[PDB]
């Protein structure tokens, strides 16, 4: 169907910034009456999606004049002339000129800050969890910015695959940072067959990759 592609997916923003959210459609959202039913929605955490702009550029009432839309044909844009905190969230574009109606990929307006450095922390699996046959190795990336950081697992220098899971806290209200946890999950079998467990972290704030490791045979 009409693939609404939303650029960017994530958009670091500072208050007072003007931010643009572009939405490009696979086909022309101008029907045979020149009416284009493209709408922009704001979804703030824990609330309902709110209509901002409908019909390319027409502001839903209750929406401040700082939100503005524009476009024609395939590529459409949402424009916030002055970001305020009440505007952070996920922004979605949506057609409606063709069925099925399709939302856009979403744009997370997050707070831009100075690039922080990931305080990395690696945790062996507890004795209690090993008694349950499973071993979860937790590598913590604490207080970093921007969100994009890379975590790689090396179990006896063997780059791990399909053996990890990531969880990122949303942006912190007090220092605008993100914290990230990568959980390497193995069986106690696989955990006891290897000795060296390492989580290496690549990040903009790290001049060199940070490798946090633990040898199973050590307290």
Partner 1 sequence: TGPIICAGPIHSNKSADIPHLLGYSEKICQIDRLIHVSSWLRNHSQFQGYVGQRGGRSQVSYYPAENSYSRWSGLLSPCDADWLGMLVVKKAKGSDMIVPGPSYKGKVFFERPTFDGYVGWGCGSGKSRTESGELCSSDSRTSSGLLPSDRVLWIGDVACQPMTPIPEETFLELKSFSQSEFPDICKIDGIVFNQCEGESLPQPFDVAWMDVGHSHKIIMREHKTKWVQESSSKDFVCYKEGTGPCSESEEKTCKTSGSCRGDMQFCKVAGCEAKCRCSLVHKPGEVVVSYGGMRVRPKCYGFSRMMATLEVS
Partner 2 sequence: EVKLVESGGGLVQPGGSLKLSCAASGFTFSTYTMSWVRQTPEKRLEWVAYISNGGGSTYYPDTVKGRFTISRDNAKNTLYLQMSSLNSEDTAMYYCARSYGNFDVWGAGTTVTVSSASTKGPSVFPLAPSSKSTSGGTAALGCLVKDYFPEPVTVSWNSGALTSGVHTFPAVLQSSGLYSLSSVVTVPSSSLGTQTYICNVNHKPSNTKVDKKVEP
Question: Does 32 participate in binding partner 1 (rule CB under 8 A)?
Answer: yes
Which of 7, 26, 74, 136 is close enough to bind partner 2 by CB under 8 A?
A: 136
* Site for partner 2, residues 164 to 183, rule: CB under 8 A: 165-170, 179, 181, 183
Only one of the segments 58-66, 106-114, 124-132, 161-169 lies at the binding site for partner 1 (rule: CB under 8 A); that segment is 58-66
Q: Which does 74 bind (CB under 5 to 8 A by kind): partner 1, partner 2, none?
A: none
CA distances from 94 to 3, 23, 101 (A): 10, 9, 7
Exposure string for 110-133, b = 16+ CB within 10 A, e = fewer: bbbbeebbbebebbbbeeeebeee
Residue among 184, 140, 134, 136 nearest 158 (CA): 184
Q: From the list partner 1, partner 2, none, which binds 85 (C-beta under 5 to 8 Å, kind-based)?
A: none
Q: 184: closest CA among 200, 207, 205, 206? A: 200
**To the nearest whole angstrom, how small is the minimum distance from the Cβ of residue 97 to partner 2?**
6
Q: Which is nearer to partner 1, 32 or 161 (by Cβ)?
A: 32
CB-side exposure of 147: number of CA atoms within 13 Å?
18
Among positions 7, 10, 30, 37, the unique one binding partner 2 when judged by CB under 8 A: 37
User: Pick from partner 1, partner 2, none: which does 90 bind, CB < 5 to 8 A by kind?
Assistant: partner 2
The entry of partner 1, partner 2, none that residue 32 binds, CB within 5 to 8 Å by partner kind: partner 1
Question: How far is 93 from 7, CA to CA, in rounded Å?
Answer: 10
Q: How far is the CB of 85 from partner 2 (least distance, A)?
A: 20
Question: Helix, strand or coil for residue 108?
Answer: strand
Q: Which two tokens stand for residue 112?
A: 């831009």
The residues facing 66 across adjacent strands are none
Contacts of 215 (CB under 8 A, 6+ apart): 195, 196, 197
Do 65 and 59 form a contact (C-beta atoms < 8 A)? yes
- Interface positions with partner 2 (CB under 8 A): 1, 37-39, 41, 43, 47-51, 54-55, 60, 90, 92, 94-97, 99-103, 105-106, 108, 119-126, 128-129, 132, 134, 136, 138, 140, 142-143, 165-170, 179, 181, 183, 185, 212-214, 219
């Amino acid at each position: 169907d009409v693939v609404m592609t939303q650029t960017p997916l994530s958009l670091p923003v500072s208050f007072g910034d003007q931010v643009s959210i572009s939405c490009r459609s696979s086909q022309s959202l101008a029907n045979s009456y020149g009416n284009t039913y493209l709408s922009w929605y704001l979804h703030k955490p824990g609330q309902s999606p709110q209509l901002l702009i409908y019909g390319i550029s027409k502001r839903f009432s209750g929406v401040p004049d700082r939100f503005s839309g524009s476009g024609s044909g395939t590529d459409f844009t949402l424009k916030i002339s002055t970001i305020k905190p009440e505007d952070l969230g996920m922004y979605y574009c949506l057609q409606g000129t063709h069925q099925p109606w399709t939302f856009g990929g979403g744009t997370k307006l997050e707070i831009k800050r100075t690039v922080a450095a990931p305080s990395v922390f690696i945790f062996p699996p507890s004795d209690e969890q090993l008694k349950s046959g499973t071993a979860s190795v937790v590598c913590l990336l604490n207080n970093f910015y921007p969100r994009e950081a890379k975590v790689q697992w090396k179990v006896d220098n063997a780059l791990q695959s399909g053996n990890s899971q990531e969880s990122v806290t949303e942006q912190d209200s007090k220092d605008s940072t993100y914290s990230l946890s990568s959980t390497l999950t193995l069986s106690k079998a696989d955990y006891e067959k290897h000795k060296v467990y390492a989580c290496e972290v690549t990040h903009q704030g790290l001049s060199s990759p940070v490798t946090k490791s633990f040898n199973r045979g050590e307290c």
